Ligand binder design. Structure first.
Ligand SMILES: CCCCCCCCCCCCC/C=C/[C@@H](O)[C@H](CO[C@@H]1O[C@H](CO)[C@@H](O[C@@H]2O[C@H](CO)[C@H](O)[C@H](O)[C@H]2O)[C@H](O)[C@H]1O)NC(=O)CCCCCCCCCCCCCCCCCCCCC
Ligand SMILES: *[C@@H]1O[C@H](CO)[C@@H](O[C@@H]2O[C@H](CO)[C@@H](O)[C@H](O)[C@H]2NC(C)=O)[C@H](O)[C@H]1NC(C)=O
Ligand SMILES: *[C@@H]1O[C@H](CO)[C@@H](O)[C@H](O)[C@H]1NC(C)=O
Ligand SMILES: *[C@@H]1O[C@H](CO)[C@@H](O)[C@H](O)[C@H]1NC(C)=O
Lengths: 238, 99, 290, 189
């Protein structure tokens, strides 16, 4: 009864910048862990706790520290972010009277960017179905687009009549680079929704594709001129 | 340290002056298990001292037996010295064939 | 009601980095096995230490124990991590596991654990448990360790089955060494007693086996009451030494004799008179610069 | 490492059965368990195997543990599109909270859709509002174009729940001049 949650979901850092990750947990678990999943490598333990107060070193304990404030809370700290560091951090809680009972959080994706100038939000435009498709197949395929966003931290979803849909929806597993050979480069990503032609024929039905972007906070006062890349939502209608 | 070593020095055989024998140093009732036992002939170290493996009695108290080949004479003296954290100074117990 | 098999384990934990575990095994009062931190394998101390067990039957146990040792070390270190304000280094644990032997295989089993010299935890039945007088903080670590039913199944097999089965094998394989008879050798002595004009007479008895012995200072048939028996002291060659002392005034020594009765002596008791032909001679070989 | 998973990447047709392997060295070996991890997601427990020779099944997931061989196998019955994730094999070295887990590198499973009506047809969508590639065949694939002007994604599998229909789709923007780095079907609108 409960869930193991870790915030933030996505994190934008800088070289040498001190970074903090938090983990709240409802189960009455005494043991809590922090892992890092390297691509093509197994999870490696960073720090773990039995409560308090307690912070025991793992195998990747160098470069990080961690602190446990409460039974529920367990925070991991990144002392200095490696310049190009892109990594996923995972929080897990476990029972002291049952080794088998172990639950994992949804994870935290990190991108260390140089500099803060590079980060900018996506622009969203939805395309309407082809008339050549209507008589050919009796189906209607909508296409959502997201371009010019940095970093990778985005969530795309389709909405019909103000309600989220998953039926006949496809999003790419990989975002495209707008410049392949770069240290930091804007991303591009596509998603398709396919519905029946009859469902489209009257634009009484409302079609929306929505992109959740994860940008900056409000305390991190940024220097540049044009609109700040805040954690925002971009949409397009049909 | 918590417990203090009992030390008892005795010989394997009846002592005859000029005849080879074995001297036993038996240390008992000590805690922690870490201890240093050295046997001395005339104040100087004997190198050929053989240690029995450490064990404990039912009452959980550690014991050990140190023994060496020795020849009793009219003038020579034999003792075993114990360095243990229970004591600030090393305890030295001399062989008294009479008691 | 005869024998007691003991596997004595002693573990020392000074700091996170430094630790050691040394083990000895006793049947009756004869050491059967020795195993030390440096030694990867268990060493035999008798030609019959393997008992009736096969090379593979034995290798099963040795591998199971080798795996246990390193598992035990790391599990203690993690327990100190868990117990933070309640308990801290240095740590001394003593395990005493084995089975008492009887007629018709009564073979009682025990696994007793001492912590810092004090007996605290006992394995019983199917589970671990703290004994009366144990520190209250042990309640949690016991729960944590009792959650492992896999360990419990292994221990229950070791105690109920593997222990009695193994030691009966030893009781036969080393029947000769267990039942051997060694004859005691006695010699008299004396020192000045604390009271002025008193002498403490000393009767040494050395090299006897088995351990039951009978030593009393006597004046004819009349047993002298002031005889003080010492503690049994081990010789290097698995034999026993004991001294019995009587306290008397100076000049009262004549007529006294140290009588010694032992199983190895047949019916012939060692009666050793004070001013004997032999005591005079043996004493002259002892003289020294007090 | 100590826990090896094989293969690194596995592909099966939608509807078939798939087999995932896990070998280990860790001692002692109290229990072995399997986790499912979607892209940008956490780990979800599927099955926990405890015994010497053990068999556990949970829904369409099933597993067999062989402790003597230090070997385990995960089966997925009637593979779906929703099983296009990473599968992680973990071993716990003790039966109490004092034990540590040992994580395998993981196995990516990619599920190829079964389409029974291949109708390759390229369409246009403009602007909007101020190029598709649908009903594309299985097995064959579109490699990323060696261009920086025109942008083309990789293939995507969508599925309508009610109408029981599935299809591959690739998108192009910067029409018939696109999609030209791999083998192309002949009868394409
Ligand atoms: C700081 C506070 C501390 C306070 C101090 C008090 C401490 C509290 C109590 C201390 C006790 C700690 C014990 C920790 C055990 C542990 O570290 C350790 C845990 O590792 C376990 O291994 C087991 C055996 O491989 C596994 O079982 C497997 O389970 C499977 C099912 O899951 C199957 O059932 C399988 O058949 C089975 O093998 C188990 O999963 C694993 O978890 N126990 C094992 O490996 C099982 C073996 C346990 C044996 C116990 C030893 C007792 C005395 C040992 C001294 C002997 C010295 C050697 C002398 C030589 C022997 C001479 C021969 C005589 C033959 C009898
Ligand atoms: C080992 O012997 C013990 C008995 O000392 C058995 O454990 C349990 O003992 C309790 C009493 O403390 C009884 O109430 C239980 O009935 C016993 N358990 C069971 C399952 O019957 C234990 O059975 C023995 N272990 C093995 C593996 O045979
Ligand atoms: C730890 O163990 C022993 C204490 O007797 C000592 O030799 C060693 O220096 C100690 N090390 C530390 C870091 O405390
Ligand atoms: C005991 O053995 C372990 C494992 O072989 C080793 O790491 C440790 O240094 C040893 N401790 C000693 C010799 O005190």
């Amino acid at each position: 009864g409960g869930i193991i949650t870790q915030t933030p979901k996505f994190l934008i850092g800088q070289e040498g910048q001190k970074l903090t990750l938090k983990c709240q947990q409802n189960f009455n678990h005494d043991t809590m862990y922090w892992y890092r999943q390297d691509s093509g490598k197994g999870l490696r333990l960073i720090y773990y706790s039995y409560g308090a107060g307690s912070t025991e070193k793992g195998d990747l304990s160098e470069g990080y520290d961690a602190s446990r404030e409460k039974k529920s809370s367990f925070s991991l700290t990144v002392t200095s972010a490696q310049k190009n560091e892109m990594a996923v951090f995972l929080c897990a809680s476990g029972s002291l009277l049952d080794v088998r009972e172990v639950f994992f959080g949804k994870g935290t994706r990190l991108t260390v960017v140089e500099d803060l100038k590079n980060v900018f939000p996506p622009e969203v435009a939805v395309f309407e179905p082809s008339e050549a498709e209507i008589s050919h197949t009796q189906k209607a395929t909508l296409v959502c687009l997201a371009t010019g966003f940095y970093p990778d931290h985005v969530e795309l979803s389709w909405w019909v009549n103000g309600k989220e849909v998953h039926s006949g929806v496809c999003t790419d597993p990989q975002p495209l680079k707008e410049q392949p050979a770069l240290n930091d480069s804007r991303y591009a990503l596509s998603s398709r929704l396919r519905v029946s032609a009859t469902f489209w024929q009257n634009p009484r039905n409302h079609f929306r594709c929505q992109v959740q972007f994860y940008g900056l906070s409000e305390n991190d006062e940024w220097t540049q001129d044009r609109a700040k890349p805040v954690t925002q939502i971009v949409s397009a209608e049909a | 340290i918590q417990k203090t070593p009992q030390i008892q020095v005795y010989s394997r055989h009846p002592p005859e002056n000029g005849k080879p024998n074995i001297l036993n140093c038996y240390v008992t009732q000590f805690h922690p298990p870490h201890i240093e036992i050295q046997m001395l002939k005339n104040g100087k170290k004997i190198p050929k001292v053989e240690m029995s493996d450490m064990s404990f009695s039912k009452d959980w108290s550690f014991y050990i037996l140190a023994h060496t080949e020795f020849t009793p004479t009219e003038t020579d003296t034999y003792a075993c010295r114990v360095k243990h954290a229970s004591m600030a100074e090393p305890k030295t117990v001399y062989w008294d064939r009479d008691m | 009601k005869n024998y007691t098999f003991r596997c004595l384990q002693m573990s020392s934990f000074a700091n996170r980095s430094w630790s050691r575990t040394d083990s000895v095994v006793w049947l009756g009062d004869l050491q059967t096995h020795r195993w030390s931190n440096d030694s990867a394998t268990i060493s035999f101390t008798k030609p019959w230490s393997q008992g009736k067990l096969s090379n593979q039957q034995w290798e099963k146990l040795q591998h199971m124990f080798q795996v246990y040792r390193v598992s035990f070390t790391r599990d203690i270190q993690e327990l100190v991590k868990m117990m933070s304000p309640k308990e801290d280094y240095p740590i001394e644990i003593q395990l005493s596991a084995g089975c008492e032997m009887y007629p018709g295989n009564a073979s009682e089993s025990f696994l007793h654990v001492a912590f810092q010299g004090k007996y605290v935890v006992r394995f019983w039945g199917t589970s671990w448990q703290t004994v009366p007088g144990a520190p209250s903080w042990l309640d949690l670590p016991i729960k944590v360790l009792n959650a492992d039913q896999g360990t419990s199944a292994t221990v229950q097999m070791l105690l109920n089955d593997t222990c009695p089965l193994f030691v009966r094998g030893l009781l036969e394989a080393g029947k000769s060494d267990l039942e051997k008879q060694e004859k005691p050798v006695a010699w008299l002595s004396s020192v000045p007693s604390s009271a002025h004009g008193h002498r403490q007479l000393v009767c040494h008895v050395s090299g006897f086996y088995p351990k039951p012995v009978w030593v009393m200072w006597m004046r004819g048939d009349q047993e002298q009451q002031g005889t003080h028996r010492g503690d049994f002291l081990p010789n290097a060659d698995e034999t026993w030494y004991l001294q019995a002392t009587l306290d008397v005034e100076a000049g009262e020594e004549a007529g006294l004799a140290c009588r010694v009765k032992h199983s190895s002596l047949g019916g012939q008791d060692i009666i050793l008179y004070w001013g004997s032909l032999h005591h005079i001679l043996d004493a002259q070989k002892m003289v020294w610069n007090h | 490492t100590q826990v090896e998973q094989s293969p690194q990447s596995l592909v099966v047709r939608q509807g078939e059965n798939s087999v995932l392997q896990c070998n280990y060295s860790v001692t002692p070996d109290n229990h072995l368990r399997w986790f499912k991890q979607d892209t940008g997601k956490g780990l979800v427990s599927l099955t926990v195997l405890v015994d010497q020779k053990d068999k556990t099944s949970n829904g369409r997931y099933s597993a067999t543990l062989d402790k003597d061989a230090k070997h385990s196998t995960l089966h997925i019955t009637a593979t779906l599109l929703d099983d296009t994730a990473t599968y992680i094999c973990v071993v716990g070295d003790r039966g109490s909270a004092l034990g540590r887990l040992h994580f395998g590198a993981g196995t990516q499973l990619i599920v190829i859709p079964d389409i029974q009506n291949p109708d390759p047809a390229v369409y246009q969508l403009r602007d909007s509002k101020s190029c598709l590639f649908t009903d594309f065949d299985s097995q064959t694939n579109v490699s990323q174009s060696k261009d920086s002007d025109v942008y083309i994604t990789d293939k995507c599998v969508l599925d309508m729940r009610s109408m029981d229909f599935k299809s591959n789709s690739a998108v192009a923007w910067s029409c018939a001049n696109a999609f030209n780095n791999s083998i192309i079907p002949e009868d394409t609108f």
